[PDB]
Each structure stands twice: as C-alpha cells, then as structure tokens.
C-alpha cells in the first residue's frame, strides 16, 4: 500500500557543491530511513529514524522530515557520493516500502566520443553470423545518437546498443552499438558505416569500414 515518491529523479552535481533530495510519503509515516547504493554493492544505511545518522556515515550527510515530507541533504557532495539514494518508510505495516531512488551523478566538461568500428572476426563468420561492432567511447554529456548505414541506406533492424554508467575515474559515458547479421546477408553488402552524433560537434563522427580490406 503506502507510496513513496522521490525528487529529483536524476541529478547531476559537481564535487564541493551542496545537495538536497526529497522523499514524499502519500500518507503520514512514523519515520523515514535513507539508503545509498553503488552498482554491484548492496544498500548501505545512511539516515535512520528520520534524522539520525548511521555508524559508518560522514557528517556531511543529514536527514530531515515532518509527516509525509522528508529529505536527505549532502552539505558538500564528495566525488565518492555519486550513487543512487532510496528512501524507505515505517508506518502502521503496509508493509515497509521503498522509493525508487534518486540518482546522483557527477558533473564535468563536455567530452567528444571516440568512435571505432570493427568488422566480424573470421572465427565469427564460421558460425554463420556476422556482428559489426561500434564503440562510441569516453563522452560527456550522455546524449548521443548512432546511425547505421549498410551500403548507403539507413538501417534500424538488428541494432543493439548498450551504455556504461558514468566512469569511475574520468566521469564519462561509453556505449557499444552492435549490428548483428547472418553470413549471407553480410556478404551481399560492402560499406558498413557507423555514424555518431553528439553535442560537442554538429557534424557527426562517421567511422566506416568497407568489406574489401586486409
């Protein structure tokens, strides 16, 4: 039953800056708890009973809240605090519920995507498949488009993109675009071009391999 809605949903702050995120209960709650979670790690307790700090928790963190409206504040955001923050409630057993997290990301200078394209390995072709991979690496902001052209025309079927979350050390995003084909389809075309467009340049970065190579 009792719903927890959080604000903001994705938040980009710079190190040294002040941070405040909100968690609203749809109905009044006895206390609120706040958790921190990094990709792969389990949830860590931060603030318990609305405003109490947990044991391993730096005093840059701080919880607030009257009935139904609560908030976790990071006074000066550190780079290590880049993570997703959940609120969770205790009221009269609905049961205990959790928000869906507010995502805290780190701010940095616009970076331009290093585009690369790879033809399928001889080994891959032997199985009857042929994938064409395009690594759009190390860019900021995360907003990109990738266009695929097999022999001049624009394709949309067979493309699979995966994105990495913000890099551990330089704070940038990277994304692999893979076009999958079958050996025979692949061998009735000659230009495979991977075309990326990102905020840091109106003209796209087009990397093109052509099936007459070496």
């Amino acid at each position: 039953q009792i719903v927890l809605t959080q604000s903001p949903a994705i938040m980009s702050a710079s190190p040294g800056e002040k941070v405040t995120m909100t968690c609203s209960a749809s109905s009044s709650v006895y206390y609120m708890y706040w958790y921190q979670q990094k990709p792969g790690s389990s949830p860590r307790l931060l603030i318990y009973d609305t405003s109490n700090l947990a044991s391993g928790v730096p005093v840059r963190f701080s919880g607030s809240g009257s009935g139904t409206s609560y908030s976790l504040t990071i006074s000066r955001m550190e780079a290590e605090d880049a993570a997703t923050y959940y609120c969770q409630q205790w009221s009269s057993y609905p049961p205990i519920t959790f928000g869906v997290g507010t995502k805290l990301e780190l701010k940095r200078a616009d970076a331009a995507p290093t585009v690369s394209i790879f033809p399928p390995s001889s080994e891959q072709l032997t199985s009857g498949g042929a994938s064409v991979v395009c690594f759009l690496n190390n860019f900021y902001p995360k907003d990109i488009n990738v266009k695929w052209k097999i022999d001049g025309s624009e394709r949309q079927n067979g493309v699979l993109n995966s994105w990495t979350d913000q890099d551990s050390k330089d704070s940038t995003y990277s994304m692999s675009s893979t076009l999958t084909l079958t050996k025979d389809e692949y061998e009735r075309h000659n230009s495979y071009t991977c075309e990326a467009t990102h905020k840091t340049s109106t003209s796209p970065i087009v990397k093109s391999f052509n099936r007459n190579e070496c």
Partner: protein, 217 residues
C-alpha cells in the same frame, strides 16, 4: 561485526520452487532483532518479502504471503527463504538483512527464472578494419557473445591491463546474452606488447583466453 551471507540455486525453471539460505556470522539469530529477506528487481525496485523474529514468529509481505515461506535452523544459525511455484517476474537479486533499522545487509544473490539453458560464451577478437586517420591510440576489444546465464567476467592481460578498459553491460541477444569489452592501448605498444582478453563463465565453468592479433594482412 555481524555478517550476513545469502546463497542458493542460481537458475530456476518456471513453476518450480526456489530456496535461498541466509547464513549469519557474529551474532545469534535468537537474541534480539527481526531477520529480513528483501529483493531487488532489475532497474532498482527493492521489495520487502518477510522476516523471522528472533523468537520464531514470521511476518510476510501481504502480496507474497501465500507463495513464500521463511524458516530457520538455530543449530546452524541459519534462516531461509523458500519461493514456491516461481514465475518469470521473480527474477531479481535476493538480500537477507538485519532488522530494525536495516543496517547489515547480505551481499546479494541473483536468481534467474528462465526456461533457458546454461550455454557457454563464444568469444571473438575485435581488431581494426583499416578505416582512416584518427589518432595515436589503438582501441581493440572482445565480443563475448551467446551465453546463459549472467555473469561472465572480462579482464585484459590477466588483470595487468586495468586502465582504458570498458566492459559494456550485457543484453539478451535471443534469450542468451551478448556482452563486449573495449581496451584502448597506445599505438606504440601494438602489437609489440601483446593485448589479450580473459573471459570466464561461472555457470558453465568456462575460461577462455583470447589474444588480439592484427587482422588478415
């Protein structure tokens, strides 16, 4: 320090019943506290499932109260979650945790509910197809495709090469996953200094090393 470690079967067939075991270290499950089982769905959603009070009593989430059952073994300091008739929708990662307030969580175990089958990964090298002027840096990589289930673990030059690496998040190819990793080395150490990708797949007990060599000519 109190210590919570869940575990149990990683792959489960629809309509069968899963059983996870949480084993706790450093504090007895009979002297104070409520012992919880909480699960985290893909994306982010945490769900409370139920708890065992130190005295024996259980409390469960009202939606899952027909389907799940929590139990214990005080001689082995263990409490268990049993999931009856599992649907696709129970695919998630299950954490046990020390109750009220929820400090002390287990590291998390993944349960995959699928009719699919433990296939090992095919790993193919990715090397430059000539292309054009770009820079003083080589990007190469590995296409780890065709496996079930998650995870595989990709490393470059046995862990020697940790900078410049980008292992991309897996995606379901055709109800088996494809995943890929990129490493960007200086053009001077290539190919004088050998780069190689080491893939590993726990479920199928597979390790495959794969040397990236300049291609074709």
């Amino acid at each position: 320090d109190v210590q919570l470690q869940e575990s149990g079967p990683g792959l489960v067939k629809p309509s069968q019943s899963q059983s996870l075991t949480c084993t706790v270290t450093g504090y007895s499950i009979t002297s104070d506290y409520a012992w919880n089982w909480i699960r985290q769905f893909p994306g982010n959603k945490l769900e409370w499932m139920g708890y065992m009070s130190y005295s024996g009593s259980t409390r469960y989430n009202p939606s899952l109260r027909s389907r799940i059952s929590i139990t214990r073994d005080t001689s082995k300091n263990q409490f268990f979650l049993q999931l009856k008739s599992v649907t696709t929708e129970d695919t998630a990662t299950y954490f046990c945790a020390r109750g009220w307030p929820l400090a002390y969580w287990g590291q998390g175990t993944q349960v995959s509910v699928s009719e699919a089958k433990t296939t090992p990964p095919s790993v193919y090298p990715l090397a430059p197809g000539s292309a054009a002027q770009t820079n003083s840096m080589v990007t190469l990589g590995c296409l780890v495709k065709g496996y079930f289930p998650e995870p595989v673990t990709v490393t470059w030059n046995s862990g020697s090469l940790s900078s410049g690496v980008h292992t991309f998040p897996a995606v379901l190819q055709s109800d088996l996953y494809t995943l890929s990793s990129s490493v960007t080395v200086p053009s001077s150490p290539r190919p004088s200094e050998t780069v190689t990708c080491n893939v590993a797949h726990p479920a199928s007990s597979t390790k495959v090393d794969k040397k990236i060599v300049p291609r074709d000519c």
